[PDB]
Every structure is written in structure tokens, then in C-alpha cells.
Amino acid sequence: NPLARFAELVATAGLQSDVQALADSGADDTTLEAQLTQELRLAHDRWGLGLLHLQHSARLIHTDGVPSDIALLVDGAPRAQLSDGARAIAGTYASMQAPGPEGRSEWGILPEGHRVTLRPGLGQLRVLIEDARDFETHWTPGAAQTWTRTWRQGETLAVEVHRPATPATALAKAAWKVITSIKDRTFQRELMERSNQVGMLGALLGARHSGAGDALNQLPEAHFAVSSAVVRETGREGREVDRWKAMQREATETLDELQKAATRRLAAVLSGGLR
Amino acid sequence: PLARFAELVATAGLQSDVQALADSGADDTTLEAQLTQELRLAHDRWGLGLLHLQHSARLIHTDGVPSDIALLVDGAPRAQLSDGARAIAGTYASMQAPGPEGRSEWGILPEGHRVTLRPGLGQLRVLIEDARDFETHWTPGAAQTWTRTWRQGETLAVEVHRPATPATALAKAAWKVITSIKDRTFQRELMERSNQVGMLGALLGARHSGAGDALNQLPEAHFAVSSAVVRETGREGREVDRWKAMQREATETLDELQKAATRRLAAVLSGGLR
Numbered sequence A: 001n002p003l004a005r006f007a008e009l010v011a012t013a014g015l016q017s018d019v020q021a022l023a024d025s026g027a028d029d030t031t032l033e034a035q036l037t038q039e040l041r042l043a044h045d046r047w048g049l050g051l052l053h054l055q056h057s058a059r060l061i062h063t064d065g066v067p068s069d070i071a072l073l074v075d076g077a078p079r080a081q082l083s084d085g086a087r088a089i090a091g092t093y094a095s096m097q098a099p100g101p102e103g104r105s106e107w108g109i110l111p112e113g114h115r116v117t118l119r120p121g122l123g124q125l126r127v128l129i130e131d132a133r134d135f136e137t138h139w140t141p142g143a144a145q146t147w148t149r150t151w152r153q154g155e156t157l158a159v160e161v162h163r164p165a166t167p168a169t170a171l172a173k174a175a176w177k178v179i180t181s182i183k184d185r186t187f188q189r190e191l192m193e194r195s196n197q198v199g200m201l202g203a204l205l206g207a208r209h210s211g212a213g214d215a216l217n218q219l220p221e222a223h224f225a226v227s228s229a230v231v232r233e234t235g236r237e238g239r240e241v242d243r244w245k246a247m248q249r250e251a252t253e254t255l256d257e258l259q260k261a262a263t264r265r266l267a268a269v270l271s272g273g274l275r
Numbered sequence B: 001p002l003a004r005f006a007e008l009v010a011t012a013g014l015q016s017d018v019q020a021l022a023d024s025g026a027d028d029t030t031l032e033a034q035l036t037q038e039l040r041l042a043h044d045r046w047g048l049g050l051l052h053l054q055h056s057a058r059l060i061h062t063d064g065v066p067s068d069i070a071l072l073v074d075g076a077p078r079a080q081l082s083d084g085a086r087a088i089a090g091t092y093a094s095m096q097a098p099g100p101e102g103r104s105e106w107g108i109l110p111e112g113h114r115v116t117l118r119p120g121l122g123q124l125r126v127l128i129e130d131a132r133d134f135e136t137h138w139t140p141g142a143a144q145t146w147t148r149t150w151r152q153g154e155t156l157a158v159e160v161h162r163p164a165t166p167a168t169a170l171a172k173a174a175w176k177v178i179t180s181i182k183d184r185t186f187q188r189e190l191m192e193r194s195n196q197v198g199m200l201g202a203l204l205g206a207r208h209s210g211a212g213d214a215l216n217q218l219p220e221a222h223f224a225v226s227s228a229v230v231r232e233t234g235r236e237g238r239e240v241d242r243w244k245a246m247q248r249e250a251t252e253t254l255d256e257l258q259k260a261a262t263r264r265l266a267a268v269l270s271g272g273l274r
Helices: A002-013 A019-024 A029-047 A086-094 A123-130 A167-180 A185-207 A212-217 A241-271 B002-012 B018-023 B028-046 B085-094 B122-129 B166-178 B184-197 B199-204 B211-217 B234-238 B240-271
Strands: A056-062 A067-074 A077-081 A140-143 A146-153 A156-162 A228-234 B055-062 B065-073 B076-080 B146-152 B155-161 B227-232
Touching: A002 A019, A002 A029, A002 A056, A002 A067, A019 A029, A029 A056, A029 A228, A077 A086, A123 A146, A123 A241, A123 B122, A146 A241, A156 A241, A167 A185, A167 A241, A185 A212, A185 A241, A228 A241, B002 B018, B002 B028, B002 B065, B002 B085, B018 B028, B028 B055, B028 B065, B028 B227, B076 B085, B122 B146, B122 B234, B122 B240, B146 B240, B155 B234, B155 B240, B166 B184, B166 B199, B166 B240, B184 B199, B199 B211, B199 B240, B211 B240, B227 B234, B227 B240
Parallel strands: none
Antiparallel strands: A056 A067, A067 A077, A140 A146, A146 A156, A156 A228, B055 B065, B065 B076, B146 B155, B155 B227
């Protein structure tokens, strides 16, 4: 019951959760909570809320054995629970954010220090990757509505690739996919006409049964979207620039695929689901 | 006491202000802050390679009243000024890790990556402007010197080091005296003996008989200047033009101290030690 709710939450970040399979295979609570933490941190790398300076963890909440809820922890303290619902969890994470005027996160990933303003070369990054210790770059454009940054913390080189997406943005792209794929022309004309009045999602929810938008609201797909992708590298490959170039290229392909897979899975919910 | 501390840091070319500070009305924390500041400046110039350790000085109280100065490493009392400069020099030498070429092997920062500089300032420009904490290996310069650069926190720092032991400095000052002898016959005699007993031994053999043991009492026979460190904080620690002035300042300080140490050492071995 509790694990299934967690698997549905992190599937909005593209994860297939292993926690129910580990619980059925005899793992204890320490192994389960380590996997819960692993999947929560991978989901926050992809949700892109700008909370990389915080430490995320999960713990099980039992009631006479028998897991009943999952506590979501930030820096060792519980801040939300899975029973709270998807809107309440996303609102707890939203009160931790600091957007700028262009919507991106203003927090540094590292503790408060010098962040690099990258000028149009690769010579700054070559010395920071090869020769430096902990460093962190500011956002720089990566094209295709994509913004990117690179940081080292200890032995771990990391790169984030970010394209901004809200759940309303992600559902609107899925609503456009369903409406454009409508076979009869007269029916899609009135939905395009209705999209000008109530938006694309509300026009597509007008062709479903009453309460489908209420059923969509209880889903984590209405409150969580993929906007980032993070690739990390530890050890000797962390100081090579050709590894970092393969890291950013991995994160861009991972971000583009996770957002396109989001568009299909949301369009299937708007067309066939919400029952 | 405070005078033995003043003689200890004078081997690093410092004129101590703790006696004038204590003659005026000043409390124990004011003295200990000035004692710590002069101790850290002395270790910058001594060049023992102990920059990874935190150095401090605290007054030792005898029945609640100060009586001696403890020398602390990482919060632990390890030495005291009443033991003399030989015991202080041996205590830090037990902490010391000398390399094969007269340089420290340990890093100043905690154990991590250190930069091997290529020729130029392409690496150091990004490291000074854009990076956080970093550390450079030794890179050579003119007149047998070696340089390294590091940032810790908001503090940029550069070190110019020329390897100098007190045995090297006493031999260098012995050559200063012998080459200034008017008699070419008496100069030939001293250098022919220096091949057997060394330059300092040959000079002390041609003085009074108690000159060697009087040299050992001096703190100059146990500490020598081998480095010079210049530091910068704030946003000017991320300017390259400040850094060029920094290792210029450190090279000129190292050269001025090592020539003033050779001169005052030569005056001790000639007419002093009585």
C-alpha cells in the first residue's frame, strides 16, 4: 500500500521502483530505506526543483509491523509523508525553492561560495575539471530551451541539464498530442476552439467523464514533472574533459527522452485513463 | 619568557612586540593573539613544511600567574619556551617530512588534488578567478627558488622557497667571513681545513675555544629562513595582477631575509661568540 504510492510518485521521474520487489524478497527495513532514498534522490535529479543543496532521504513508517506510510526527510528531519498526497508533498518542496526572474533555481548546489560565470569557451572548464577541487558553475545556455551547469563536490564531478517544465506545461503538451491525433476533423476543431477559452487540458477534460479532472488532481502526474537530468562521475574519470563532454551529452539525451516519454504517458492518461 | 620568544622569532627576521604589549596594560588573550601571530609569521619564514598544522601560543600559568609560553600544534601543547631553541627545533622536526630535494612533501591543504603547472598562467588564471580551494605543487624560479600557490577559503597565498637549513646558513656565513680575509695565506689555511672539518668548523677552529658551544646556545643555530608567504583575502584574492605582486613580494622578502641572515651570522662568527 505504502510502497505502491512511492512507486507511482517516482514514476513521474521515469523510475521503475524496486522497493516492492525488495520487500517481497526478504529485505529488512535498512535495505528498503536505502532503496527509498536512492530512488528519491534520482527523482529529485529529474524533477529539477533546485534542492540539490539539501540532503534527501526516506524512512518507513510501520503500524504493528506492516508498512503504512513513508516519511520524506530533508537534512535528517521529516518534512512530508506519502499519505499527505501529491499536492501537499509538492507544496512542501516548493516552499524550499528560490526561483529567479527567469524561473531557474537561484540556489547554489555547493555551500555558499564563488560560482563561475562561464564565458564562451572551454578553457575555464578545462582547468576546473583537471586541476581544481570543488567548483560550481552558474547556469549557461545549452540551446533548445536547455540550461546547464557543472560542479565538483569531493571526488564527484557532476553536470545538470535543465529544460523548464511544470506539470501544467507537461499536461498541455500531452493534451496537444491527443487533440492533433483526433481522426474526425469537426471534433478537433471545437477542441482547438475550446482550448482558446479554458486551455488545452480543460478542453480535453471536457471530452471525458465528469470528475476525470478531479481524478487527475490526486495523481502525482498533476504535481510533478521532469525538468532536469544529472550525470555524475567519481574517481579518475572526474578530471577528464572528454568524460565531462560525454556526461553532458548523456544528460541532454536523458532529459530529452524523459520528457518525450512523459508526453506519451500523460497522453495515455488523458485519453484512456482517469477511469 | 617573552624575551626568549623575541629571540626565537628574530631568527625569522621578526622584531617582537609582545614585551612592549605586556609592558602596557594588556590581557592574556591580547598577548596570546600577538604571540600566535608572530609564531605563524615565523613558521612562514622558517619554511618547515608545517602549513597543514595550526600553530598557536598560550601563556602557561604558575599558581595563576603567567610564567612561560607554550607552543601549540592543533590545539595540543607540544613545546615551551623555557626548554630552549634546540628542543623547539627538534619538536617541529619530528613533525616534519623533508623531501629528497630540500622541500616539503606534504600538502598545505588536506589530502587531495594538487596542480602540476604547465608553463604560463592559463591554469592559474582560472584557479585564482574561478575556482574555490586549490593547491599547486612546487614550480621552480630564478636563483634556485621554488614556488607554490594555494587558496583556502577566501585566502589566496603564495610561497617562494629557497632550501635553507641552519647548517647551510652557518656554512654560507662562514664562507662570507673567509672570503673577506685580507691575508691570502690565512684564507688558504681555513679553506684547506674546511675540506676536512667543513667551513663552519674551520672558522670556529680559528677563534676562541668556547665559540662552538656559545653558538649552540643561540637560536640562530637551530632555525633558518627558507621561505616567505604572502596572503590576500577578499575579492582581490581573485585577481591575477594581485597574485603577480604577491610572489614578487615573497621573492623579494625571501632574498632580503636570507642576505640579512648571512650578514648577521657572519658578524656573530667573526667578532661575537664571546
